Design a protein around this ligand. Structure first.
Ligand SMILES: CC(C)(C)c1cc(NC(=O)Nc2ccc(Oc3ccncc3)cc2)no1
Ligand SMILES: CC(C)(C)c1cc(NC(=O)Nc2ccc(Oc3ccncc3)cc2)no1
Lengths: 278, 278
């Protein structure tokens, strides 16, 4: 069973506002004139360019799942080229974790749910035919919906989530199935700590040197003893960011370890975590 | 840009417990072994039977939107035939409105959000090429997700895709004014928490009354004066269920009416209404 991705005429996008700018182009918010929903527009502002947008659209359309940014349509016009997705109103994980004045507390149930949902999403990509690999997993690429549920995106930067064997890339390093789990381990650490990994280091180049020798600090300072399931978590972090790519777990194995942890949290506590953020 | 609907092997559908039966098919709650998610399966409990299921999967896959039940894949084997969708943990709108012991209080902010989302999902269906017309809209087909957001479904106890309370009179014996009629009945039901035609014993007695231009009661008893935007909501109801199909509004008009009503609610009030249910 096949399904075509809708084509959205640029003029059907009303109330267009700039959100961000960088690599792969600019991101804008808008409303669909006929659908009456708020949308996000990732666009370029010539033939090779056209093919890139069409390829991203196809991946996003095929990667359709509960914890993946939902694509709504494509703008493929002489005057405009862009990807139209659902609008994520609560920014990224990065902004939740590090805007500490705006967000004083981020309750453990919400933190563990975010971790469980990142793993559910990456796991799904890894189970496609053929497997889909992110290879640029970072806190900026973890979008949060209205109820602070995860949608994995790719904004198209930091080296802190990169496995050391990816530093000098090749045909084997780009085909690595143990890259995402390294990034996940650092994300897992950054979520439980609310600390910028390798904060004390001066140069990203020095971080690369440090990393290649053999990680961000696992102590009482960074990770206090009151962290729910601390031991099992630390064991998962250490295991995921292990210098030997073969000494790294699958996302399925992490999920199986995470499933009992999430059950120790009462359903109400997730709703209370979110009300606390508003 | 085409997307193939994933094929799920029956053996990946762990803990397959039944939920509800019908003359056409059955609905069961499984758990995907690889994806680690709770799912719903609508299966046949062969030539024609196969074409019927695949046509429903083709419709659901093409109808993908924020307020339509998301299809995760098809389970097409000589042993088993079923559609895998996401699992809606909070039941249906019928249950929320009429299980008054379970839910003594369903706050206005949530009621309006539900009505807005029914209209968004129906409006999207009508905007497809060719337009998809539900024609069997009822509270039972309005499913409630983890966060009490709407997912429009089509339960098929009688037939796969291709009560008379929500049916317009002209339909007793193609119409693009049916779903709006059904929508007007649902709106009345949501705001009153009453069963349409409470004293009427026989469905033929409803069919007779309706054909004579009579509708569910609109007074202080059914619709209290304390209802936010009462006058405005009654006008929408009365337009929606008009005897003359042509006097009924489009979903665009209906959404343009709803939009300023929903803006009057602070975002936190929706969260608070949902927590009050937990
Ligand atoms: C399948 C996966 C590997 C995860 C992926 C995502 C992707 N494109 C993308 O995320 N595009 C994108 C990114 C950020 C955007 O910005 C938003 C979105 C929603 N709300 C606010 C900003 C919009 C589109 N291509 O492959
Ligand atoms: C586009 C639209 C007209 C709205 C539609 C729905 C549909 N099929 C369907 O909903 N099938 C279905 C219904 C109920 C199910 O049972 C569930 C689903 C989720 N959670 C609990 C029970 C499973 C599949 N075909 O066209």
């Amino acid at each position: 069973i096949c399904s075509a991705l809708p084509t959205i005429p640029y003029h059907k996008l009303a109330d267009l506002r700039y959100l961000s700018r960088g690599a792969s182009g600019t991101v804008s918010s808008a409303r669909h004139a006929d659908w009456r929903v708020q949308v996000a527009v990732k666009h370029l502002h010539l033939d090779s360019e056209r093919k890139d947008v069409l390829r991203e659209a196809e991946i996003l359309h095929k990667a359709r799942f509960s914890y993946i940014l939902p694509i709504l349509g494509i703008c493929n016009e002489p005057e405009f080229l862009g990807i139209v997705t659902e609008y994520m109103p609560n920014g990224s994980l990065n902004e939740l974790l590090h805007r500490k004045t705006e967000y004083p507390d981020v309750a453990w149930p919400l933190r563990f749910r975010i971790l469980h949902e990142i793993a559910l999403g990456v796991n799904y990509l890894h189970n496609m035919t053929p497997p889909l690999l992110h290879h640029d997993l970072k806190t900026q690429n973890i979008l949060l919906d209205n109820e602070f549920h995860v949608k994995i995106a790719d904004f198209g930067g930091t080296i802190i989530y990169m496995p050391p064997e990816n530093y000098e890339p090749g045909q084997k390093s780009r085909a690595s199935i143990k890259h995402d789990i390294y990034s996940y381990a650092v994300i897992t650490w950054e979520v439980l700590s609310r600390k910028q990994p390798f904060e004390d280091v001066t140069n990203p180049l020095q971080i690369m040197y440090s990393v290649s020798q053999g990680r961000p600090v696992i102590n009482e300072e960074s990770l206090p003893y009151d962290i729910p399931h601390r031991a099992r978590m630390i064991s998962l972090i250490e295991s995921g960011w292990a210098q030997n790519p073969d000494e790294r777990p699958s996302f399925l194995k992490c999920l199986i370890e995470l499933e009992p942890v999430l059950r120790t949290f009462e359903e109400i506590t997730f709703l209370e975590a979110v009300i606390q953020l508003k």
